[model samples]
Target: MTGREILEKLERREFTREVLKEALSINDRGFNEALFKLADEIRRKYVGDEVHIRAIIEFSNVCRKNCLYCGLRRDNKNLKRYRMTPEEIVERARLAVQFGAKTIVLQSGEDPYXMPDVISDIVKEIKKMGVAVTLSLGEWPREYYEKWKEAGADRYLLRHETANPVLHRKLRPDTSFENRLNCLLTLKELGYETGAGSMVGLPGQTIDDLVDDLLFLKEHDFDMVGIGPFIPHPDTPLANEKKGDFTLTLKMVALTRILLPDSNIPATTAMGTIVPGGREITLRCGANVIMPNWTPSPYRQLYQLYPGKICVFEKDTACIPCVMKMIELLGRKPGRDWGGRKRVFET
Candidate 1:
């Protein structure tokens, strides 16, 4: 079927991988115009025009996994690593609130130093301040997941990176695809608003793979999707690899909105890392969330998951107003309240 036909079926809530394949194959501006418009309209109907801001605090930089695409792999001894003291993280979270962040996202490379008791206490401390907390500490045990939730973390993020099983193996190496999927499943069953994301244009990732990523997200009924282009890290194995196209990255964001209308899709920082105005342009496309850096000073620039990350030098205080102006330019406003995902799932 043609792109137009596929989009029509999408408007009526009729989904099939075949139709998605046709929709994805359309690269022409004329075809993309219709595709993006449909996705944007669906986003408005389901999630409204409001764009939520989740202030992200990169609390730790030490990771055990050697994901080939990332700079924080355990083997990468060239990088400086730091783990914020619990008091330090809580201090940053409070500053985020003063700067108008209703939600605090505590992200890190998967480190075991901060055990369940440690993380759970951090969650409890953040919750006491009346701001919602989201965790991105990578995969862990169900017991830890449950403890964190009970300690009051409202959401969790675990990016699948690339969902194609073969590439998933090559990139993640030690971690199995089934293991990752089960971690996501474990998070979902624990009653947290779970999130999973993908990287666009990974080497060997095909249009079919992109289609599978979107379908995989929709099938699991994820509450948040962090889709972004693959920007290479100079310290990693794929340092010389080609970067993903910004235009195609925007297309993927639009398509993600079309397929999972109610899911919270962020205008990823990695997008803006590759090109200027990428984060703003995505807000205009189909994305309704912008997660800005609330991670403080020296540590912020230190966690280079991918090199050339934007806002690394800016203080969390400076980052908020800067992104606010971009949101205002698009006639959208910063989200009020905790910016938690609307629960419509019948679980």
Candidate 2:
């Protein structure tokens, strides 16, 4: 079937595994043009043209798992580790709110020393600033998630990485797919606006695996979805593997916008790192959110999920105006509200 025909079927709510595969397999430039156009139209209809800007602070880089694709893996002794005190994190968040960020994302690796109570105290302090709070600390027990939610955290993010069971095991040797899904489920049950994301290219990842990622996102109807290309970190096991395809990654973003029209999708920093104007092109196509790194420099350089991350050397406050200029250049206004998901899925 032609790409347009399959897309029309999707527009009519006729989703099947075969049809999704066909859409993913399209390589013709003209077909891709039509696909992105339709996705953009749907984006405009559901989410409008205001691009939401979220400030992310990478507070800690210490981790327990040695994932094959990450630079922060526990086994990478070459990486220097650091953590911010609750007082330091809260102070940075206060400055973020002053600079017009409505959401503050507190991201760190799974550090056992970063206790739940310490995090909850940080959350409570940031909440007093009147901006929405989001936590991206790695997977933890239900009690931990419940503790943070009670302390005024509005969202939690845990990337599932992939839906292929065997590949998931291989990538994260010490983690289980069942446990990851359970963590996501528990986050939702506690009334947090939950998010899950995946990398576009990883070793052993196939077209079928990408399809399953899309299906998983659609099934869960997560409030937010962050999709990005898989860049190999030189210190990891996948160092020799080639990077993910840029065009294919964009296709995934556009297709995701089509499937989950109202879900908040960010033009990830990995996208901008892969190519010039990559994030701008994404905003034109389907993306409606931009997350600028607010982490202070000395620590930001250490939280290397992948190498050559953009804006690692800039002054802490430089990213906000740069992002605003980018949005204005595209004729879209920067979002001033909390920028939460517009649609809520019922259980």
Candidate 3:
């Protein structure tokens, strides 16, 4: 199918099975040109040249689960592990806020050290500063979710990774598919603006797998959906595998905007690290959010989920403005508001 044909389909909300199949088959110059034009159109209509920036602080690298693709997997001997105290996390939050990030995402691995009460205290502390708090610590019990919510967590991000049960199991043997779904549902039920998504071109993934993931997002009605390319970790089992396709990832970002019009889609750093101007291209293709690393430099290398991660060793003062400049170069303005459902007030 032609790019104009795809744009027409998008305009009419006619994402039929045939259209998706044709999109999957797209791999020629004509298709690329069409996709570029359609992406620009979608970006103009849905997300203007305004970049909603969020700061991600990797508070902990200690994890218990051994996901096959992650560098910080419990059994990876090559990884350097660390964890930050709540006070330290809050201090970083203060710095991020000073740098103009209205939303502070506290992300970590599934380490038992940072349990419900611990997370709750951190959430409360960040809330005290009047900035929105979002958590990406892996799955936990129902009570933990409630505890964080009660402590003033405005949003939660728990990527399902993949909706296919078999694939999910293969990737994360220690975790269960039901548990992941339950976590997402629990977050939604607790009135949290929930975020969920999967990786593109993950090992063993098919077009059907991608479709199922999209359908899952549509059915769950997630407030945010983060999609990024799968980069391999040399220390992990999926090392030496082919990296995710950038074009397909961009297409998925555009399609996601079409699928969930109001969803907050982030142009992930992983995408930018993988391809030059990747995040900028994604913004032009319809993604609206850009999460810059606010984790301290001392701990940045320790927070490596995958090997050869980008933007790790840059100077401390360079991170925020570097991203801001990138956004500006893409003809987008960096915003300074808690962009989720609630507009958090500073105390």
Top candidate when judged by lDDT against the true structure: 2
Stretches off by above 4 angstroms in model 1 are: 343-347
Weakest 10 consecutive residues, lDDT, candidate 2? 338-347
Q: Where is model 3 more than 4 Å wrong at Cα?
A: 1-4, 341-347
Worst 10 residues of 1 by lDDT: 338-347
Per-residue lDDT of 196-228 in model 1, one digit per residue for the tens?
989998888899999889889888988899988
RMSD of each: 1.7, 1.5, 3.8
Q: lDDT tens digits, residues 285-315, model 2?
A: 7899999999986788898999999998888
> What global local distance difference test value does model 1 have?
0.86
Tens digits of lDDT, candidate 3, 167-283: 999899998788899989999999999999989999999887887887788788788889999999888889989999998887777777776766788988878878988887888
User: Model 3, residue 238: displacement in angstroms?
Assistant: 1.1
Q: Please, what is the TM-score per model? A: 0.96, 0.98, 0.94
User: What's the true lDDT of residue 53 in model 1?
Assistant: 86
Worst 10 residues of 3 by lDDT: 338-347
